[PDB]
Amino acid sequence: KIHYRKDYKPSGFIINNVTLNINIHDNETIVRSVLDMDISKHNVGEDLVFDGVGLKINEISINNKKLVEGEEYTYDNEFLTIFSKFVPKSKFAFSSEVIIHPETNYALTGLYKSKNIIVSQCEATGFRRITFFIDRPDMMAKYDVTVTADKEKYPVLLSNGDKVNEFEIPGGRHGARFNDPHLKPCYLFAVVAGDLKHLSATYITKYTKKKVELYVFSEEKYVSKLQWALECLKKSMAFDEDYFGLEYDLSRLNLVAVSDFNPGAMENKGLNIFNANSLLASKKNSIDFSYARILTVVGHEYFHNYTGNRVTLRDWFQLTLKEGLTVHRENLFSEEMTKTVTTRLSHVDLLRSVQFLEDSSPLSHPIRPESYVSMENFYTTTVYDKGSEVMRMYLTILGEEYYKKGFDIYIKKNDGNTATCEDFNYAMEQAYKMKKADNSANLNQYLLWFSQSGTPHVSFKYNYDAEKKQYSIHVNQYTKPDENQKEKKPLFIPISVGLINPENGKEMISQTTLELTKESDTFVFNNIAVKPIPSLFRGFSAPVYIEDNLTDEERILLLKYDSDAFVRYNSCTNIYMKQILMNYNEFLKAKNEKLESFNLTPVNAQFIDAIKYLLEDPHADAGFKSYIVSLPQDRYIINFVSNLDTDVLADTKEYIYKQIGDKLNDVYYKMFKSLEAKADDLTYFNDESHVDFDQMNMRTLRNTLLSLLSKAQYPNILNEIIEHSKSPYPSNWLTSLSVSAYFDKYFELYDKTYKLSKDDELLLQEWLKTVSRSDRKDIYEILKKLENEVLKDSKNPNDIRAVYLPFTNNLRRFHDISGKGYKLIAEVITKTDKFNPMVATQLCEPFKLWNKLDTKRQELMLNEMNTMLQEPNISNNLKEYLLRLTNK
């Protein structure tokens, strides 16, 4: 059954209070539930229908009167229908006792066992797997939750909000009772039972001076990995205070790491639950990236407390309202915390590769979809990441002071309520009127960012009149029609711009934002003393394809002299893309025409010089440098190529890297050696409260250079690889594994890094990813080895994703023209779907680009997807996904 956005209608029922008793035993969990309910003003005498999936009914009652199956109710394992003539016409209690089995719940939705922890995950529709409910986010209620369990196995019992009681129960059990005073949707319900250890701290809110207890929890083995998360939480709270004026609203906030988790984390009120890989780190047992990830995910979940929890969703179509906005808030936070331009660049990199691919695929949707079958399929980079760019554009358009004003209005007006995207636009519109000093100004056109799918293309033409000192920028926008809209409309696109004097490299104007609201416009600048080079979409100011129509000479000048990190990075990207497209077509023609000989265009020599120039500048960001010596992502490139022959693209990238290395490899080696002391310095190695993001960037750079030098078989590089493997930083010694792929020492380092990894669950998963990603001719045999020796029969999403996903990025081998990469992943998807549909769909990622490949590869991918579609008992989740991806 399809849900349509336009069909939204309030429930004919109200649920005011939920009182739960959750009694956990080894071989069953019993859930007793009383809902204090009422008839809404929208009620039209309908049956009372509860969602309830996979529940075993012991009893149901209305008002102390037992209801009888086949007489008063029916239940079909998805819906409990109570016939209207038995439903009261005023306030009443509904109560039920059901049996569930977390110990056999491998889908990790509802209540499940993760190792030795019992934990819930209810977003989006998991609560119906715990007990009967009207399981939709506009049914808000207050929760009174008792959990009971064996004391010895489950000494720590948690649910949302204030703990009001703990008590002994005969038989060696105990119970804990919680009251959450805040109205919430059921998706924000959580419970946890485990032998948990913690770190804690106290935080005093900035304005009202509330004392808040902060606890972070994990299994005993990993308690020493909790400290950075606790520091990140404090940073998050301070930031929401300082930037947004927002204070936490409960006496206690708990974060809990679990080993088996589908998402990254979950913002349950007062009880945030994390994938361990996004909560736990230590410097001896985690890669550098873990520290940024944890800062990101802790901040994200914390910021949900307002954007998601205190203001929640009217319906699931509004998902981007909490996810887009929360990602945006986390981006501001992370950028402020890390103080490196690579934070913003990394987000742009992900948008323009993964999200752009999505937006040009058959899966393309607007950030607010018009329909769904399974909401699970819309936790997408479109909803999260394009969402965040749409939320960011408000700040770009309004500026900080007015943005904060509009956000305040949003919070003030909707606090304690459900909300829609229109509510957020309305608030921003008020700030807009205030800023334009004009009560007739409006953001009606802005709404198109929510409803219209596809990436806009913004293109540029220029005129300089030297006599008048007058510069003109003519801008055009175009969105390609697709299955969502036959006719696309012009968006409100803010374009942040500067102008660079190419003669001296200086800024010629104060940075300004051009507001393009039409299909095209011409913006004219007076008193421009020399012909400038434009610096366009600074900070990446809108989520668009940029066609700068600049020469490579001009891009090089921007790369060298522009102040904006994005424009420099993008100028580099465009130079690479021109070269890739040229060399790709040259190889392609030679192949197609079976030429005995042909020419390749060399890489621009002034560009190579500019790379040298930047690398040798010790004041330039090391993270930025690592971007400039790397070609654009395959998934970014594919947006510019029809009928992509992956082997030809692989040859193209190889040729380009070789041409650059022939000039730069000695410089690369020099830098690798000179960066070492600063990069690998052990300051803070024992301090999980301090992270030097600049130093981490230096390590990234060194590892990037080592990778380039290894691929090139630079003289005696193996010696440096071996030495690198003895570093205390896992980022280094895991790099040494993957760069050794090109040498006979690979399996030696394979074994060594395994032994270093095998005793830490999360580090082992990093090791798995490193092997999966290894550039090996025998990679298929290696995957089999991983299957038989390490992964075996694991149902842990982290393990499965670690083994297979990174491999699918192997341009040469995953896309083997035999189709054996496709067949391998399809088999895994089908196997996984039998116990965890959510993860099965995630594993489909590689197929998203099927219709962009050459005809043979298209056919092979299509064959595998149609095969998956034919599997008996295929989940709704996977079926919906694959039917959409294959155009029906």
Ligand X SMILES: NC(=[NH2+])NCCC[C@H](N)C(=O)O
* Pick from 306, 327, 308: nearest CA to 316: 308
Q: Which is nearer to Mg ion, 119 or 390 (CB)?
A: 119
Cα–Cα distance for residue pair 535/101, rounded to 1 Å: 59
Q: Which is nearer to ligand X, 123 or 816 (CB)?
A: 123
Cα–Cα distance for residue pair 541/348, rounded to 1 Å: 10
Look at residue 880 and give the partner it binds from Mg ion, ligand X, Zn ion, none, a contact being a CB closer than 5 to 8 Å depending on partner kind.
none
Q: Which is nearer to Zn ion, 131 or 326 (CB)?
A: 326
Look at residue 111 and give the partner it binds from Mg ion, ligand X, Zn ion, none, a contact being a CB closer than 5 to 8 Å depending on partner kind.
none
* Pick from 333, 240, 242, 260: nearest CA to 295: 333
Among 247, 301, 423, 586, binds ligand X (CB under 6 A): 301
Smallest distance, Å, CB 93 to Mg ion?
24
Site for ligand X contains 300 (CB under 6 A): yes
SS3 469: coil
Smallest distance, Å, CB 299 to ligand X?
11
* Pick from 129, 75, 124, 134: nearest CA to 104: 129
Cα–Cα distance for residue pair 387/363, rounded to 1 Å: 16
Q: Which residues contact 768 (CB under 8 A, 6 or more apart)?
A: 786, 790, 791, 799, 802, 803
Q: Which is nearer to ligand X, 263 or 502 (CB)?
A: 263
Look at residue 97 and give the partner it binds from ligand X, Zn ion, Mg ion, none, a contact being a CB closer than 5 to 8 Å depending on partner kind.
none
Q: Which is nearer to Zn ion, 323 or 359 (CB)?
A: 323
Cα–Cα distance for residue pair 380/844, rounded to 1 Å: 13
Q: Which residues contact 242 (CB under 8 A, 6 or more apart)?
A: 206
Span between the terminal Cα atoms of the chain, in Å: 16
Look at residue 265 and give the partner it binds from ligand X, Mg ion, Zn ion, none, a contact being a CB closer than 5 to 8 Å depending on partner kind.
ligand X
Smallest distance, Å, CB 318 to ligand X?
13
Stretch that binds Mg ion, among 47-55, 109-117, 700-708, 710-718 (CB under 5 A): 47-55
Tell me phi and psi for residue 210, to 5 degrees. Answer: -70, 135
Which residue matches tokens 């909803």? 383
Q: Which is nearer to ligand X, 54 or 263 (CB)?
A: 263
Among 124, 644, 783, 786, binds ligand X (CB under 6 A): 124
Q: Which is nearer to ligand X, 738 or 842 (CB)?
A: 842
What part of residues 372-401 is at the interface with ligand X (CB under 6 A)? 376, 379
Residues annotated as part of the active site: 301
Smallest distance, Å, CB 126 to ligand X?
8
Q: Which residues contact 384 (CB under 8 A, 6 or more apart)?
A: 320, 323, 324, 327
Site for ligand X contains 548 (CB under 6 A): no
Q: Which is nearer to ligand X, 124 or 497 (CB)?
A: 124
Residues pairing with 459 in the sheet: 476, 547
Residues pairing with 24 in the sheet: 29
Q: Which is nearer to ligand X, 725 or 836 (CB)?
A: 836
* Pick from 634, 646, 704: nearest CA to 354: 634
Smallest distance, Å, CB 66 to Mg ion?
22
**Binding string to ligand X for residues 84 to 123, with x set by CB under 6 A, is what?**
---------------------------------------x
Cα–Cα distance for residue pair 813/821, rounded to 1 Å: 7
Q: Which is nearer to ligand X, 329 or 815 (CB)?
A: 329
Stretch that binds ligand X, among 265-273, 339-347, 399-407, 768-776 (CB under 6 A): 265-273
Smallest distance, Å, CB 106 to ligand X?
16
Among 263, 362, 505, 539, binds ligand X (CB under 6 A): 263
What long-range pairs does 752-761 form, CB within 8 A, spacing at least 24? 752/725, 753/725, 756/730, 760/285, 761/222, 761/259, 761/276
Q: What's the DSSP call for residue 90?
A: S
Smallest distance, Å, CB 374 to ligand X?
9
Smallest distance, Å, CB 301 to Mg ion?
28
The binding site comprises 123, 264-265, 267, 300, 304, 323
Stretch that binds ligand X, among 260-268, 460-468, 565-573, 617-625 (CB under 6 A): 260-268
Smallest distance, Å, CB 70 to Mg ion?
21
Where on the chain is the footprint of Zn ion (CB under 5 A)? 323, 326
Cα–Cα distance for residue pair 738/736, rounded to 1 Å: 6
Beta strand spans in 420-492 (E): 457-465, 470-478
DSSP character string of 285-328: TS-THHHHHHHHHHHHHHHTTTBTTTEEESSGGGHHHHHHHHHH
Look at residue 54 and give the partner it binds from Zn ion, ligand X, Mg ion, none, a contact being a CB closer than 5 to 8 Å depending on partner kind.
Mg ion
Beta strand spans in 108-155 (E): 110-114, 117-121, 141-150
For 422-433, letters b (16+ CB in 10 Å) and e give: ebbbbbbbbbbb
For 512-534, letters b (16+ CB in 10 Å) and e give: eebebeeeebeeebeebeebbbb
Site for ligand X contains 266 (CB under 6 A): yes
Look at residue 260 and give the partner it binds from Zn ion, ligand X, Mg ion, none, a contact being a CB closer than 5 to 8 Å depending on partner kind.
none
Cα–Cα distance for residue pair 281/137, rounded to 1 Å: 33
Stretch that binds ligand X, among 166-174, 207-215, 262-270, 691-699 (CB under 6 A): 262-270
The binding site for Zn(2+) comprises 300, 304, 323
Stretch that binds ligand X, among 111-119, 257-265, 279-287, 689-697 (CB under 6 A): 257-265
Among 97, 180, 260, 267, binds ligand X (CB under 6 A): 267
Residues making up the chain, counted from first to last: 888
Contact in structure between 369 and 488 (CB atoms under 8 Å): no
The binding site for a peptide comprises 123, 264-265, 267
SS3 749: helix
Smallest distance, Å, CB 371 to ligand X?
17
Q: Which is nearer to Zn ion, 270 or 498 (CB)?
A: 270
Q: What's the DSSP call for residue 542?
A: S
What part of residues 311-350 is at the interface with ligand X (CB under 6 A)? 323
Look at residue 362 and give the partner it binds from Zn ion, ligand X, Mg ion, none, a contact being a CB closer than 5 to 8 Å depending on partner kind.
none
Look at residue 263 and give the partner it binds from Zn ion, ligand X, Mg ion, none, a contact being a CB closer than 5 to 8 Å depending on partner kind.
ligand X
# of chain residues touching Mg ion (CB under 5 A): 1
Site for ligand X contains 845 (CB under 6 A): no
Q: Which residues contact 888 (CB under 8 A, 6 or more apart)?
A: none
Among 25, 38, 54, 718, binds Mg ion (CB under 5 A): 54
Smallest distance, Å, CB 56 to Mg ion?
6
Residue type, 30: I
Contact in structure between 569 and 516 (CB atoms under 8 Å): no
Contact in structure between 144 and 179 (CB atoms under 8 Å): yes
Cα–Cα distance for residue pair 67/76, rounded to 1 Å: 16
Binding site for ligand X (CB under 6 A): 123-124, 262-263, 265-267, 300-301, 323, 376, 379
Binding site for Mg ion (CB under 5 A): 54
